[PDB]
Design an enzyme around this catalytic site. Structure first.
Site, PDB file in Angstrom:
ATOM      1  N   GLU A 295      19.575  17.984 -30.710  1.00 46.04           N
ATOM      2  CA  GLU A 295      18.866  18.523 -29.559  1.00 46.04           C
ATOM      3  C   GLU A 295      17.659  19.256 -30.132  1.00 46.04           C
ATOM      4  O   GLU A 295      17.829  20.180 -30.930  1.00 46.04           O
ATOM      5  CB  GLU A 295      19.774  19.490 -28.801  1.00 46.04           C
ATOM      6  N   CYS A 329      15.258  25.982 -24.841  1.00 42.76           N
ATOM      7  CA  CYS A 329      14.807  24.597 -24.922  1.00 42.76           C
ATOM      8  C   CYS A 329      14.459  24.043 -23.550  1.00 42.76           C
ATOM      9  O   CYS A 329      13.775  23.031 -23.442  1.00 42.76           O
ATOM     10  CB  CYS A 329      15.902  23.714 -25.522  1.00 42.76           C
ATOM     11  SG  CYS A 329      16.551  24.251 -27.112  1.00 42.76           S
TER      12      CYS A 329
HETATM   13  O1  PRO Z   1      19.783  24.623 -19.420  1.00 38.41           O
HETATM   14  C1  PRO Z   1      19.661  25.594 -20.177  1.00 38.41           C
HETATM   15  O2  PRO Z   1      18.911  26.517 -19.853  1.00 38.41           O
HETATM   16  C2  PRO Z   1      20.415  25.668 -21.498  1.00 38.41           C
HETATM   17  C3  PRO Z   1      19.492  25.303 -22.655  1.00 38.41           C
HETATM   18  C4  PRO Z   1      20.415  24.735 -23.676  1.00 38.41           C
HETATM   19  C5  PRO Z   1      21.484  23.995 -22.904  1.00 38.41           C
HETATM   20  N1  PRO Z   1      21.464  24.650 -21.585  1.00 38.41           N
END
Ligand code: PRO
Ligand code: PRO
Ligand code: PRO
Ligand code: PRO
Ligand code: PRO
Ligand code: PRO
Ligand code: PRO
Lengths: 543, 546
Positions: A295, A329
């Site tokens: 990721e 992210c």
């Molecule tokens: O959706 C979000 O904000 C977080 C970021 C990493 C995975 N979920």
């Protein structure tokens, strides 16, 4: 019947409640106590190989982002020799762990989840607040809810996977064994979510793997708390090795081992590419083909149509851009607004901006967000602010200030770009820096195309609109611009089991942690056919 | 609060395995096959590259030969040049979005229609082309070009249609939906000579999932591969979804790995070639719009392990079939047999007696043929060298066979060799020919020998244990857990059936994505999750902040 397969049961789970922390609530009281328990404290956090606490001479410190005089942890970097010993010990524990019934492995994670939900909640929240600079609610949705959900939902998904079995026709019985990967998995986790570390190491371990976990330097305190909880919940020695290390040293070492079978990574594009290339260079030596999961971030959008609800645009964008200092992210960093709504949206953004409190999240629960994570992040963000002061196409509308004298404090910043393809519209800053491009209403379609084409990324994005035809069109046009796509909601805050998370383009391999398929990357299935009658002659009747 | 995105109800599909026909005298299928074989006698098909609906020729003319009568050129085809490959990529990319947006059920219908055609009116054609072009016997063609290919098409259609029913939890004020997107870019499919069905699956499964594909079929299976391609088009596959592009292997790999739009390689073939492609992608990693997905199946050095409690006749029949059917040219074929000393007199005698009854010959002319010529001159030369090795090695002895003759076809007799060294090179290297090596172990060393079965080779594809003692089976199963991805108890190591034994293994044998099972299609989708929220968001502040 040489082999007998025990019937697989089902697991019922639901999402962990998000607490409100109201005055006089049990959780607010517990959290205040846990924060007090960390005040002025430094934990000496060792590397852990098996049950051995190991110290090297390569001492490091984790600093509280909002008070960098506070060393919240003293830890050390594992050297190549220690990493290699950790690999050896993990490999020797793997077969027994892999042979355990899936339900028994799942139980460790279910127990850990209940510990995190109840008696350890305040601890992991406080350690995430003090060590990573999160506010109460940001810590709650992360170190409690998301982590708990990963543990419970992945357990459910894994138990259920054993029910996915092939067809058997007499006189044979077929069964799929969901084997762990043969070798060890390297888990490399980021500073910004305590939960991601738990998942990167924990999901492969659930599936029968052994793991070298290199936690983020800047999340060491909370990461070790999670590690200890897993051990207390029954995780055997040598299943997850807790091995902080220099990034390049860790990568070099694990990609040099013939026993590497997977890398579970969250971090930068260049680092993921480098690891991919190291594996390719050493491809001859590995006993099998390693599986890389990555990721790698995003340059995420909020696209506004003229039919949008302005107040939702404003609150959703302020949250997405600025919660946790934009260090997500998934954070919105490019906002596209039609000219007809710009006077409203500009006025509301600037007014609300002036009311955002940036300060100490442990001492002031009124804080919206706090300091960014470390000196390197501060320096990068400052570079982008200096760029916004330099570029003829950019104008800082609000904010722009920073001060690193006490903590790594960056004020939220709103910038307007006259150039929809300015570098600031393309590159991931990981700071509280929102760029707005105002488009002519009669060019909304051309602008949707720019949303899709401008960046290298494909992670999150939102469209705000109350016109059905527009929503249908935008959805089709932006199909590959976002792996997590939102209609009339903010681009952050994915919830396990509800919005499995990830995207393609430069954003990574899109294995969707949070959904039912993620665990499949960490199993290499075997199918066993048992035949219950003697085999016939080798000839065929048509012969 | 109205839902602006509306999601259609999901469907299911009932499918069963395609029944294997008997081809007995008096059966319609035997008559139909004899006619189809006659239709190929003396014929050469000129097979073009196909880009969109255009038939394209280059100067690089190639011929496919009948393995058992290599004077028969069964097909004249050509290798796509780099220009044509790039043209094919561009046209595929231009067709992709529309195909990806098609409902999964509509894409599945193409494959279900193709399966129906293969089952019925086109069965004899694809069987005959696989027999004449790849040297298969009637039954080997039947289980491959008909049954396995048909099953891939039907079962993958079921798996794909039903995958859309795998949806996330929704909680107020929102609705969540997973869109199973195809990969953005194109997929390169590279298929092997030895199974017609594998080519159909390597190109077909990604296409089913909304991808567009450049398919480089195997030179030595061109005739049957093009037959499958034509059937897919007739079944309604739109132009530019699968480009039929035979090509020089290295040239094809160079071209596809040089495109910024490569999103996947679906490969079956050798370990070195798969590694080379992997390294080419890594070298070019900067240019790709996303991270390409490599899937590879790379062969095996498969075992039959016999315990003293084994049923002797089952060991003999199962091993003869696994080692020698289709001349041992299967990634799953048994090439190492481990026998306990106490059963060796019985088993050796039986193997040698049955060996003398194995008929090698022309599979089109003589349906009594057990197996025919190996695929080509290169395979013949490699096998011949291993036979010579068996004659010159102090640790090896040829018990039966050893002869070969390439004057008319690439004919190799079945060969049984005994090794006194369990780690001899012939116990380690994949020959892809009718060459079985036997190692006889003292009964009291069965445990140590199981460890050798597991550690001797670099592969992890198939294997069998023959034993009628439950404790021994349980022990062997644990010990061999990673020695075989397809593991068999009291059955032969070949002949996996779609939906019953999903196929594949790890170690050097590949990425183990288990084609034939319900999860394979997941490699060819990159899911998106859409959250639609139906109520206004409220303030940016939280209540605890007050
Ligand atoms: O959706 C979000 O904000 C977080 C970021 C990493 C995975 N979920
Ligand atoms: O449906 C069947 O028959 C196989 C066995 C149980 C689950 N799938
Ligand atoms: O190159 C080889 O032979 C082994 C197989 C997996 C990767 N390395
Ligand atoms: O920006 C950087 O480079 C460091 C590494 C993660 C946290 N900040
Ligand atoms: O290197 C890059 O930036 C892009 C991202 C996916 C692979 N190539
Ligand atoms: O043995 C070889 O090299 C060729 C390639 C596949 C068919 N025979
Ligand atoms: O099991 C077998 O014999 C074949 C080999 C390729 C896939 N299935």
């Amino acid at each position: 019947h040489m082999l007998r397969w025990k019937h697989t049961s089902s697991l019922k789970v639901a999402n962990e409640p998000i607490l409100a922390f109201s005055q006089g609530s049990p959780e607010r009281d517990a959290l205040q106590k846990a924060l007090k328990d960390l005040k002025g404290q430094t934990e000496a956090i060792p590397c852990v190989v098996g049950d051995e606490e190991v110290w090297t001479s390569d001492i490091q410190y984790q600093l509280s982002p909002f008070n960098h005089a506070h060393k919240v942890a003293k830890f050390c970097y594992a050297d190549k020799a220690l990493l290699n010993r950790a690999i050896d010990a993990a490999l020797a524990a793997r077969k027994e762990w892999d042979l355990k019934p899936m339900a028994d492995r799942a139980q460790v994670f279910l127990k850990a989840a209940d510990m995190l939900s109840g008696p350890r909640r305040a601890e992991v929240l406080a350690k995430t607040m003090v060590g990573q600079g999160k506010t109460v609610i940001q810590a709650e949705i992360d170190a409690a809810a998301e982590l708990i959900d990963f543990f419970r939902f992945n357990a459910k998904f894994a138990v259920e996977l054993e029910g996915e079995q092939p067809i058997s026709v007499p006189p044979s019985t077929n069964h799929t064994v969901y084997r762990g990967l043969e070798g060890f998995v390297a888990a490399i986790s980021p500073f910004n979510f305590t939960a991601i570390g738990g998942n990167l190491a924990g999901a492969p371990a659930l599936m029968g793997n052994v793991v070298l976990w290199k936690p983020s330097d800047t999340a060491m305190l909370a990461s070790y708390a999670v590690y200890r909880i897993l051990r207390e919940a029954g995780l055997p020695p040598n299943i997850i090795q807790f091995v902080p290390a220099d990034g390049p040293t860790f990568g070099d070492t694990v990609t040099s081992s013939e026993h590497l079978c997977g890398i579970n990574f969250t971090g930068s594009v260049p680092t993921f590419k480098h690891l991919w290339r190291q594996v390719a260079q050493n491809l001859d030596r590995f006993r099998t083909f390693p599986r890389l999961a990555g990721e790698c971030g995003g340059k995420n959008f909020h696209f506004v149509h003229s039919s949008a609800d302005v107040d939702s645009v404003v609150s959703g964008t302020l949250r997405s851009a600025f919660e946790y200092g934009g260090q997500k992210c998934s954070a919105c960093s490019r906002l596209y607004v039609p000219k007809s709504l710009w006077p409203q949206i500009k006025g509301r953004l600037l007014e609300e901006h002036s009311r955002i409190k940036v300060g100490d999240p442990a001492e002031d629960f009124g804080t919206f967000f706090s300091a960014v994570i470390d000196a390197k992040a501060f320096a990068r963000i400052k570079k982008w602010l200096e760029h916004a002061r330099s570029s003829p196409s950019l104008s800082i509308l609000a904010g722009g200030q920073c001060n690193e004298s006490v903590g790594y404090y960056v004020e939220p910043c709103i910038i307007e770009s006259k150039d929809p393809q300015e570098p600031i519209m393309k590159e991931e800053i990981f700071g509280p820096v929102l760029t707005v491009y105002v488009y002519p209403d009669d060019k909304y379609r051309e602008t949707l195309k720019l949303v899709d084409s401008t960046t290298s990324y494909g992670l999150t994005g939102a469209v705000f609109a109350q016109d059905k035809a527009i929503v249908q069109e935008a959805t089709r046009m932006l199909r590959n611009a976002a792996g997590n796509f939102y209609i009339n909601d903010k681009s952050t805050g994915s919830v396990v089991g509800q919005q499995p998370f990830g995207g393609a383009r430069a954003s990574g391999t899109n294995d969707k942690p949070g959904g039912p398929h993620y665990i499949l990357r960490w199993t290499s299935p075997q199918v066993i056919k048992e035949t219950h009658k003697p085999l016939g002659d080798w000839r065929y009747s048509y012969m």
